[PDB]
Amino acid sequence: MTKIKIVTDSSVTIEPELVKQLDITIVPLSVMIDNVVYSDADLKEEGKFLQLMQESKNLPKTSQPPVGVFAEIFEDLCKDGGQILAIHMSHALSGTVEAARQGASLSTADVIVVDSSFTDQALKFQVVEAAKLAQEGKDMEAILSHVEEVKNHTELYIGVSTLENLVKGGRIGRVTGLLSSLLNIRVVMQMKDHELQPMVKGRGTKTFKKWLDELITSLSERAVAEIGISYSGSDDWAKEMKESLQAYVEKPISVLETGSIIQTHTGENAWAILIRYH
């Protein structure tokens, strides 16, 4: 057969050892910082991108991987005679997945391309479950079906402390019915069917804590398989959320600094709660 090979993009937020252990291939996005282009692959060191974005003259600008890079990576991976499954961030956030579709079509490899409908650790849940099944030698049908199951049992919540990065990066366009006369405000959103749906907005310092208490109430009678927490800036608030959420899931919670691609659009002092239910 040769086992199926899993591909994703560098919007995935994941422990780096897990990438190697499950033979996942990560296609890097890039980001321009004061007119200098960096590969996302060189911005994974804790706090490194944060510090560049804090000091850069210009707001950074993110870029999807080229069609051609996807085609070239798919060609090298299929030399073993295997199929490829590429799982990518939402088409609503990035052209990445369309680039993978074009790349697949240009390559001679047998390549299936799936839109995760998410990013960050929610994309991680799909990718990791795909790679686990791949390495057990499951076929493409079985992998796709289980990955869909993971997706359909996943929720993504995000909190931002400013809207300026979302406005300047354009992804404010995917936020449905948010009215704010202020950019410097705290907002919690749910990413649902490729839209960012606002759940609450507030200037005050308890906006996130109050929202969290409502989340925890709702988790009373859910069976939770995994919780991941991601953050930009310092991890203080993320660690506090972990303390209250860990009681609700057996598996230890991964608390991870999000990547440069997401930090560019969220700004500092953002966070995410990624939940996969049984």
Ligand X SMILES: CCCCCCCC/C=C\CCCCCCCC(=O)O
- Using CB under 5 A, list all residues that contact Na ion: 107, 109
Helices (H) and strands (E) in the chain, counts: 10, 13
Binding test (CB under 6 A) with ligand X, winner from 24, 191, 215, 245: 191
Is residue 231 within 8 Å of 257, Cβ to Cβ? yes
For residues 140 and 104, give the distance between their C-alpha atoms in angstroms, rounded to a whole number.
16
User: Is 63 a binder of ligand X (CB under 6 A)?
Assistant: yes
CB nearer Na ion, residue 111 or residue 272: 111
- Indicate which of Na ion, ligand X, none lies near residue 113 (CB less than 5 to 8 Å, by partner kind): none
- Indicate which of ligand X, Na ion, none lies near residue 107 (CB less than 5 to 8 Å, by partner kind): Na ion
Name the nearest CA neighbour of 93 among 10, 202, 149, 26. 10
- Indicate which of Na ion, ligand X, none lies near residue 191 (CB less than 5 to 8 Å, by partner kind): ligand X
Shortest Å, Cβ 10 to ligand X: 10
Is residue 82 within 8 Å of 138, Cβ to Cβ? no
Binding test (CB under 6 A) with ligand X, winner from 258, 267, 273, 275: 258
Which phi-psi region, left, alpha or beta, contains residue 177 (left: φ > 0; alpha: ψ -120 to 50)? left
Say how many residues touch ligand X, by CB under 6 A: 24
185 Cβ contact partners less than 8 Å away, ≥ 6 residues apart: 162, 163, 201, 202, 203
For residues 130 and 151, give the distance between their C-alpha atoms in angstroms, rounded to a whole number.
11
Residue with the two structure tokens 């069609």: 67
- Indicate which of Na ion, ligand X, none lies near residue 10 (CB less than 5 to 8 Å, by partner kind): none
For residues 3 and 181, give the distance between their C-alpha atoms in angstroms, rounded to a whole number.
53
Sole window of 58-66, 108-116, 198-206, 216-224 interacting with ligand X (rule: CB under 6 A): 58-66
Q: What is the chain's alpha carbon radius of gyration, rounded to the nearest angstrom?
A: 18
For the segment 118-177, give every residue that binds ligand X (CB under 6 A).
119-120, 158, 171
User: Is 117 a binder of ligand X (CB under 6 A)?
Assistant: no
Q: What six digits make up the tokens of 231?
A: 């953050």
For residues 198 and 176, give the distance between their C-alpha atoms in angstroms, rounded to a whole number.
7
- Indicate which of Na ion, ligand X, none lies near residue 64 (CB less than 5 to 8 Å, by partner kind): ligand X
For the segment 204-243, give every residue that binds ligand X (CB under 6 A).
230-232
Which positions touch ligand X (CB under 6 A)? Answer: 29, 62-64, 93-96, 119-120, 158, 171, 191, 230-232, 258, 261-262, 265-266, 270-272
